[PDB]
Amino acid sequence: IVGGTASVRGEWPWQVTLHTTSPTQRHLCGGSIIGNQWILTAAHCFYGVESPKILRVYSGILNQSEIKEDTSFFGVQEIIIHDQYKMAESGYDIALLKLETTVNYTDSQRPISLPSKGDRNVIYTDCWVTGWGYRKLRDKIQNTLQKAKIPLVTNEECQKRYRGHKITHKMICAGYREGGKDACKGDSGGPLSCKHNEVWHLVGITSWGEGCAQRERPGVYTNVVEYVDWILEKTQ
Numbered sequence: 541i542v543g544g545t546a547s548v549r550g551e552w553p554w555q556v557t558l559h560t561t562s563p564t565q566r567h568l569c570g571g572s573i574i575g576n577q578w579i580l581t582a583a584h585c586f587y588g589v590e591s592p593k594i595l596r597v598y599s600g601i602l603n604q605s606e607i608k609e610d611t612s613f614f615g616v617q618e619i620i621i622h623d624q625y626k627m628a629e630s631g632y633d634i635a636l637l638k639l640e641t642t643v644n645y646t647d648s649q650r651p652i653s654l655p656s657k658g659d660r661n662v663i664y665t666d667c668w669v670t671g672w673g674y675r676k677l678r679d680k681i682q683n684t685l686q687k688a689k690i691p692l693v694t695n696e697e698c699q700k701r702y703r704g705h706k707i708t709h710k711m712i713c714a715g716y717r718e719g720g721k722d723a724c725k726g727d728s729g730g731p732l733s734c735k736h737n738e739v740w741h742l743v744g745i746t747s748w749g750e751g752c753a754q755r756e757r758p759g760v761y762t763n764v765v766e767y768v769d770w771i772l773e774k775t776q
């Protein structure tokens with residue numbers, strides 16, 4: 541996260557850190573708890589992942605440095621990538637992780653609601669991106685989970701900034717005209733969380749952008765409301 545600030549313990553309890561353990565253990569991507577056995581994340585996180593056997597899902601993490609050889613994690617039973625996914629910039633950047641057991645929900649590990657039936661025309665004004673990603677284009681994974689408030693942009697404005705890409709109704713964009721706050725490398729798969737009537741909804745999945753926090757280059761997110769039918773089909 542560029543231009544963000546440290547989170548506190550318990551602040552974003554649907555946020556997970558997805559680790560690979562091949563060839564060494566590291567943070568790969570963010571993800572969001574959407575059900576007791578379900579993480580919603582980005583398909584592009586699994587490029588070069590040989591199988592779910594090497595993945596670990598950690599919940600209730602504030603600092604990456606909390607994770608030690610005895611820290612409990614959820615195994616991943618299945619990675620469900622959207623069957624039309626080809627590359628982040630061409631859309632369908634969405635994946636479900638089915639966990640090997642159920643999360644018992646606590647103060648540290650809670651689900652986020654999908655965007656709700658009847659809210660397709662809500663204008664979200666309170667949207668936050670979170671993650672352990674770089675704070676600039678050439679940086680490192682951050683220890684402490686970062687947060688940044690970012691305004692949604694119209695698909696029309698977003699398409700005008702990305703004339704070499706197809707910005708579709710299945711994407712949502714967010715950023716400041718003068719840049720400075722954005723997702724960056726290692727935030728992919730994490731949430732764009734929007735609060736409406738004091739309820740959080742998982743509006744976006746961090747997907748791609750041109751650099752990080754550049755002027756007139758908003759971040760591009762998977763538009764979760766356009767995948768609710770796909771999520772319910774896969775999870776039922």
Ligand SMILES: O=C(Cn1c2c(c(-c3cccc(Cl)c3)cc1=O)C(=O)N=C2)Nc1ccc(-c2nnn[nH]2)cc1
Pocket residue numbers: 566567568569673680681722723724725726727728729746747748749750751752753758759760761
């Ligand atoms: O960069 C990635 C994958 N990614 C991308 C992009 C973005 C991205 C950039 C700007 C806005 C938005 Cl909404 C997304 C995030 C993002 O996470 C991108 O535009 N193109 C790729 N993953 C990643 C993980 C980990 C290390 C890493 N590990 N150790 N050191 N670095 C290094 C990169």
